[PDB]
Symmetry: D3
Subunit: 234 residues, 6 copies
Amino acid sequence: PVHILAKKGEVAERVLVVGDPGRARLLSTLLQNPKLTNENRGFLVYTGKYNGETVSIATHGIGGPSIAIVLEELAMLGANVFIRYGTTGALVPYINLGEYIIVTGASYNQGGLFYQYLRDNACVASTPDFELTNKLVTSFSKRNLKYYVGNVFSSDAFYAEDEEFVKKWSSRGNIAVEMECATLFTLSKVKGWKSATVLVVSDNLAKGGIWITKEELEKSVMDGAKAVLDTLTS
Amino acid sequence: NPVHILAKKGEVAERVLVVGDPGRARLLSTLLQNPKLTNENRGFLVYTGKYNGETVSIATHGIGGPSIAIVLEELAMLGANVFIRYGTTGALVPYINLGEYIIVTGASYNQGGLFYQYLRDNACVASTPDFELTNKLVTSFSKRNLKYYVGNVFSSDAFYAEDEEFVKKWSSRGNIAVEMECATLFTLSKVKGWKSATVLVVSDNLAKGGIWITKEELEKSVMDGAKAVLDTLTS
Amino acid sequence: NPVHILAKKGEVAERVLVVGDPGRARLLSTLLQNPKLTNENRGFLVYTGKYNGETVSIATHGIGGPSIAIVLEELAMLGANVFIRYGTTGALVPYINLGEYIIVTGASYNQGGLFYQYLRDNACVASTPDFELTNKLVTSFSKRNLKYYVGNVFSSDAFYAEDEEFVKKWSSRGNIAVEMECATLFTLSKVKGWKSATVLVVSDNLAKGGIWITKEELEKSVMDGAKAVLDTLTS
Amino acid sequence: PVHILAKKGEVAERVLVVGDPGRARLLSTLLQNPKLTNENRGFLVYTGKYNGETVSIATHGIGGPSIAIVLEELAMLGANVFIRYGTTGALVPYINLGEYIIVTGASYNQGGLFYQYLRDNACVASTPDFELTNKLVTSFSKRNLKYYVGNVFSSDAFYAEDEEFVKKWSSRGNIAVEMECATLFTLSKVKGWKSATVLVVSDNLAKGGIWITKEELEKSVMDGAKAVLDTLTS
Amino acid sequence: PVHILAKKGEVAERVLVVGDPGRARLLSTLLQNPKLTNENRGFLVYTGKYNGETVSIATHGIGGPSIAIVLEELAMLGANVFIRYGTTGALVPYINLGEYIIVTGASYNQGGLFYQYLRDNACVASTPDFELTNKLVTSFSKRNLKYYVGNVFSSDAFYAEDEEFVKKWSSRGNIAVEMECATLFTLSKVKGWKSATVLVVSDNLAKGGIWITKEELEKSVMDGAKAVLDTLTS
Amino acid sequence: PVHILAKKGEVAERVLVVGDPGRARLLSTLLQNPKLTNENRGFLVYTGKYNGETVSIATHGIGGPSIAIVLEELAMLGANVFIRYGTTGALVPYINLGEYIIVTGASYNQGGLFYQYLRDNACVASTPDFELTNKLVTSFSKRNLKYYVGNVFSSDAFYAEDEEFVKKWSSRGNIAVEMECATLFTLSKVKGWKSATVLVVSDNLAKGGIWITKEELEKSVMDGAKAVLDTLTS
């Protein structure tokens, strides 16, 4: 571990991963006796208790290259189950801000990180663990939360322009866009890790007029985190 | 109008079980009530009957992405919108036994041709089946006490192309079996708005020597799986 | 051994006329002396008889590169080494009339899948038929006073994929017609050392409205062309 | 900007960017009257004065996707001159630890980010601003620092295995490897920004290793930072 | 015409194209009352008479980019029929030095020039005109010359190393390697020009031990040129 | 070498390369006691002295494939420092005819030549030698010549149509277009040669046109050549 500087036995087997260190710390308060195991390079990691089960909440930063490093090092420290909990922008009009999307697969443009790991340009199925995903669905529905199940496009260029973005990716079967799922899923399949993803809808690209308040999004993040933690400790 | 599948509108059901071998289509039609052959053009046998109070069609798709794409497109033009592929496959992992089943959760594939023509560029669009439908398949195979494994498959386009590290390469990429039509089915269904899924009967294990099964042991496996699929399609 | 074409060794001739429609294979077998069905597995009808004192087989290859690749591979394993594809096609240029023929000199294609698996990279390997064999086809069609055009074709993998400038794009690239198996046939024959060629019956013109021909006018066209191909195969 | 929440007027036109939030905090002590203008998502940004000019030190995280986001938002807040200061692994045996590499270009594997921005697979020259780079050579020369000028490979997969890694990239004209330069240079050429990069060698992939010290590196990092600030304010 | 500076009516409709200006001048002596119409940038072009038929012999230099420019300009000057006459290296052991190969198609690596003309990476059939090629075969056989008919690989890198070169390209259906055929054929199909190619075997890559004398190769070049000219004026 | 038939010891380590054989002949008059060491295939090579150093002026023809062959053979004959001096079309409105462009990098479309040499599709940084390029800036400055420093697009298809040519390449950080730089730079990085390039602007693709004269260009070409020779002998 060059970036995450935790010690032997500090990182839990099951980890809730988020991109924003602010969210990691915030969610750490849902744990019992949470301990900061790492803060190097801003990647905050907390290990505490949830439902009497030891788990960790880790920061993975933005982008495939970043989350790949974090996952590799966390696994080197004992982690083998990862559930990414993040924010996304819907690509379909019917989804509201504050609702969730349980990811079933990730579309991505070839090259870069994937070529280095896969060694060629084959489109390897980028999917989460079947079982873990169904467990998330039960957990969310059990908590009466509004979620949608579908694929997402994992973009590498947040600001790159594309006048046909929404139609293009929505017509391709994706209902939302974020940036780490493809990497998380593919690397996991290749390394043998059990992974899944649930995203909180913070924006709707198919409706640049709707908005959620700050207090209403943090409540959405908190309610979902509980559902994810129920799953990580089930 | 369709130029390969010459069935008339109203002769193809909304729910379709698709298989590659026209012989399997004929053999499975016996599971339907009052089965009627609605097409035989170009050898693409399509039967339409009932099952569980639902009208269902069993259609032949031939071998390969190009062939299945054509059949799916035409069936859809004839009103089909729910497809469940029931095929045969070679396992890529040691622990999966012959005659057992694989419920597909995704398909790996090499870019090019068909995908480029439909998608218009070389993006790796997630090639996955309908979530709801796939879980129902699981439920039906479980309710009928059948041994299944859930995982991704590699949809190859060249059955006989040589590749020395084939099995290890694709199994290390998270695929547990290999066949040739899933990527096309999933991706095209995604683009066209169709609900699709797939279950495969393991007829070979590329990871474990050359173990075998009696011809009858295999037919039973195919028959048992067909019933579970038909239950799903009509659930 | 072959797992799709279940003909036994000695049941498939060295010279094979291959067609995509199993119905055409049956219909053309009548041109052979003492035609015998040597396979029907998976609908791939293969007939073997004589013509001009030569033993010849007529085999079904289904639709698409993946399908024809499998059939060619297995027929070859059964001793075949000379293949002449006789199919149907859509002209990309205005001046070619329905029922007329196109003797293929090359095939354009989109890289990917099958080609990548066989070639191992994305090189554009010249996809051309055997020179000697193609000239003989020309000679036979000329000797039988049939109207043919000689030129390249685009071997598409997605029959229904949308492309607004399709006809102009491919015709401006030097292709006079479009079908789906030539690139695979030519390239694979090149790699495997087989002698292959192809003649196509024009059943549609994508460049000129929607002119048509009687069903019988078409069958005659197919029959007349089959005779010329059989003459070539046995010359 | 949704990531860097600095107020307009809180980010300088001249920006020194580093991947580690920790390094940004440490280097802010080199500015006069340093103010923290952003803390969101861990992307610490400091603004202050140096040699009579307003300057900012910003965190870009790891990988092309992350730095692209940060550069775009800093640019939207007024930044137009960027100088990345990072760590790297040398690909040639003669470069010692603690020394510096002034980058003249970046090799990269075609990938999603470049495709989304460039709209095709063209290998656009990924180079820094010529003038700015020479000013860097001048500043590092004036401070008597040991540096080498050359191309670097901007990798997207820190942990991807490659049996011939060193031989391959060194034979392609690269003397070091890192992860954000290609993105920085290419994005800057497309956006019209002036950019450059200096790297501190913290490891040598071509040599068994060198005997240095956590404090020899500290000084090396600080010394270089002064050279960059001089350049940014030249 | 920026490179070939001929005037209206100087370039013939039918042109024999060779890569070496030395060969163009040498072959010009087979014509009657040959006139040098251009020598700009070394691209020597001669227009004379053969069998009472007006024809031209033009220099196209080495490589796809070079021959593409020459063909484009020659066509702009009235040319529409081109028969490339050059040298090649056999990829099969059974062909001797001084014999000829009548090209039926050309294999090539995608990209560069082809992407600019074709606008994407489709593998367009790169073949010569069917009729013209058969005419060459009759002409050579008529002159009792030893030729082979087959495809060739049009390489862009004469010195690029490839330890499996011969097996790779020979197993792909090519019997020889040169550098302009793919360009000649594809551009011709796209521009509507009638083209063909005959190559003189100057080397056998599948036998790095055989050699031909200088007087024996020039006789091979002269004998073949006559056969090609018979065809261009038939 | 099978193309450049110069005798070993007849080619200098320092070489000024130009595409036009005619320009090579014209510039040889700048050397002391110029000797023609190669005439084969039109690739005129002259060797002589200048500022107390042996120097060669060689012809490379048009396109990457041609220059690659010439560079490889000159290198086999002892050349290791190359400076290309060519003509170019500006992609930005502010550059006037007769002025110069000192190239800092080359954009290119992935193609056969790069694939054969690099063995894959990696976008290796195609840059000139940093030192050599600065020496060029110095020599052109000392001779009071008007130049601009920037990247160029190395095209393979002079006549390929592209409705948005200028906008596309200028927006990608390129200020001019030519055809051999990418090959020169990349091959040199892989082979260990020291290379650079200066271009004379003979046309401006972004502006209707400028009123110059065949003799203003002659002088521009001669003046630049002296600046390059000074650099090569610096």
